[PDB]
């Protein structure tokens, strides 16, 4: 008996195989590299998670986002927003985030 109703989290692959692709390291530009390496990036190749990590440092440390709404990043007059293809951006739009970064990498 087990009254502890817990999900059996394990590598159980009967019908499906986990949808997991090798996290593609993205290709940067000098502009990205300057922001990355200036916020503590040791890498020259980095995955999407690492973009979130390092690119987020840049937005934070420069305080390019709004004062009242953290989910609203202006970064206007900077290269960041520009390069994303935007005047400002919302971190709520995941798809936009991917594409704004993807705009700057080669695949």
């Amino acid at each position: 008996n087990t009254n502890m109703s817990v999900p059996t989290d394990g590598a159980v692959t009967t019908s499906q195989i986990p949808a997991s692709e090798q996290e593609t390291l993205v290709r940067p530009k000098p502009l990205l590299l300057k922001l990355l390496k200036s916020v503590g990036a040791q890498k020259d190749t980095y995955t999407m998670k690492e973009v979130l990590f390092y690119l987020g440092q840049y937005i934070m440390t420069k305080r390019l986002y709004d004062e009242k709404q953290q989910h609203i990043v202006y970064c206007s007059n900077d290269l960041l927003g520009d390069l994303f293809g935007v005047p400002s951006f919302s971190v709520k739009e995941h798809r936009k985030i991917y594409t704004m970064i993807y705009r700057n990498l080669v695949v």
Binding site: S20, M48, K49, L52, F53, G56, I59, M60, Y65, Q69, Q70, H71, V73, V91, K92, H94, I97
Partner: peptide
């Protein structure tokens, strides 16, 4: 969603 910190929602927006 309230006022979720830029620190988290940005760094946690990746698929998996």
């Amino acid at each position: 969603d309230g006022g979720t910190t830029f620190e988290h929602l940005w760094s946690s927006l990746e698929p998996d």
